[PDB]
Design an enzyme around this catalytic site. Structure first.
Site, PDB file in Angstrom:
ATOM      1  CB  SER A  47      -0.868  -0.067   1.077  1.00  0.00           C
ATOM      2  OG  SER A  47      -1.794  -1.006   1.286  1.00  0.00           O
ATOM      3  CE  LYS A  50      -4.324   1.612  -1.176  1.00  0.00           C
ATOM      4  NZ  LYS A  50      -3.715   0.399  -0.868  1.00  0.00           N
ATOM      5  CB  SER A  95      -4.483   1.654   3.244  1.00  0.00           C
ATOM      6  OG  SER A  95      -3.383   0.880   2.352  1.00  0.00           O
TER       7      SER A  95
HETATM    8  O1  LIG Z   1      -1.432  -0.763   5.946  1.00  0.00           O
HETATM    9  C1  LIG Z   1      -2.204  -0.686   6.842  1.00  0.00           C
HETATM   10  O2  LIG Z   1      -1.747  -0.286   8.034  1.00  0.00           O
HETATM   11  C2  LIG Z   1      -3.350  -1.394   7.019  1.00  0.00           C
HETATM   12  C3  LIG Z   1      -4.652  -0.598   6.429  1.00  0.00           C
HETATM   13  C4  LIG Z   1      -5.829  -1.001   6.687  1.00  0.00           C
HETATM   14  C5  LIG Z   1      -6.021  -2.265   6.733  1.00  0.00           C
HETATM   15  C6  LIG Z   1      -5.085  -3.247   7.491  1.00  0.00           C
HETATM   16  C7  LIG Z   1      -5.353  -4.392   7.783  1.00  0.00           C
HETATM   17  C8  LIG Z   1      -5.171  -5.671   6.754  1.00  0.00           C
HETATM   18  C9  LIG Z   1      -5.505  -7.133   7.146  1.00  0.00           C
HETATM   19  C10 LIG Z   1      -5.808  -7.319   8.356  1.00  0.00           C
HETATM   20  N1  LIG Z   1      -5.941  -8.435   9.079  1.00  0.00           N
HETATM   21  C11 LIG Z   1      -6.017  -8.117  10.396  1.00  0.00           C
HETATM   22  C12 LIG Z   1      -5.957  -6.899  10.717  1.00  0.00           C
HETATM   23  C13 LIG Z   1      -5.512  -6.152   9.328  1.00  0.00           C
HETATM   24  C14 LIG Z   1      -5.462  -4.998   9.082  1.00  0.00           C
HETATM   25  C15 LIG Z   1      -3.677  -2.679   7.428  1.00  0.00           C
END
Ligand SMILES: O=C(O)c1cccc(-c2ccc3[nH]ccc3c2)c1
EC number: 3.5.2.6
Length: 242
Positions: A47, A50, A95
């Site tokens: 990400s 992006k 994201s």
């Molecule tokens: O890059 C990021 O910081 C981000 C932004 C939004 C969502 C996530 C994310 C993805 C899968 C997950 N599975 C369990 C928790 C979790 C979190 C990460």
């Protein structure tokens, strides 16, 4: 000029983790890192991509401005904040992958590949599916290469309009107070080993700017908060932020 300071390794070791922090002092044109091999090891950008994707979409007119609304496709996904309408600012804050996959499909292979070369971005390789190559394709980028790219963005030197770069930098805004401004983007790469987290950006001070790019092992989603926590501890240690 580059300096290695292995004392910073404590910030990762204490959390039973491993990673690299890279700092660049713009005024002095000097770099600092805890680990210099890993600083030059290339990972999936996930990400963090992006950023370039936003720049390209804006410059090509796929995105009109930061207010254009991208309607939720009505498909329930396991991230609640994705199941709603988004503009560039909120799609960036949360994201929101499916929004950017559509950006990529409209950009197309030819224009995406050409613009990543013009950006000198990573290994500039988009092999894979156009709507997922930054998650499970062949594109790769290192922390030091993240720095090089962000410095160009900061100075409006990327080969897109000044307007496009101002908008993406606005969308990157993460934190602001009376002491500093942080514009940055997180990343979380899980589809190809090793699983890592990213945080790349810069810190704006009154009379200097500090660019940063970090990655760290992320076997579970439970440690994602360490991406920002570790980086900020380093900044505090180096007396960049209070
Ligand atoms: O890059 C990021 O910081 C981000 C932004 C939004 C969502 C996530 C994310 C993805 C899968 C997950 N599975 C369990 C928790 C979790 C979190 C990460």
């Amino acid at each position: 000029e580059w300096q290695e300071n292995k004392s910073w390794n404590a910030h990762f070791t204490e959390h039973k983790s491993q990673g690299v922090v890279v700092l660049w002092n713009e005024n002095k044109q000097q770099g600092f890192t805890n680990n210099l091999k890993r600083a030059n090891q290339a990972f999936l950008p996930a990400s963090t991509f992006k950023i370039p994707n936003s720049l390209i979409a804006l410059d090509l007119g796929v995105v009109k401005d930061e207010h254009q609304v991208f309607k939720w496709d009505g498909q329930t996904r396991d991230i609640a904040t994705w199941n709603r309408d988004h503009n560039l600012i909120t799609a960036m804050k949360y994201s929101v992958v499916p929004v950017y996959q559509e950006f990529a499909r409209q950009i197309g292979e030819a224009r995406m590949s050409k613009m990543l070369h013009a950006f000198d971005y990573g290994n500039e390789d988009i092999s894979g599916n156009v709507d997922s190559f930054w998650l499970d394709g062949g594109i790769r980028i290192s922390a030091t290469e993240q720095i090089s790219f962000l410095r160009k963005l900061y100075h409006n030197k990327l080969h897109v309009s000044e307007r496009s770069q101002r908008i993406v930098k606005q969308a990157m805004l993460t934190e602001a107070n009376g002491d500093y401004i942080i514009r940055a983007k997180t990343g979380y790469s899980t589809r190809i080993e090793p699983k890592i987290g990213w945080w790349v950006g810069w810190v704006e001070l009154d009379d200097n700017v500090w660019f940063f790019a970090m990655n760290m092992d992320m076997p579970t989603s439970d440690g994602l908060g360490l991406r920002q926590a570790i980086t900020k501890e380093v900044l505090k240690q180096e007396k960049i932020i209070p």
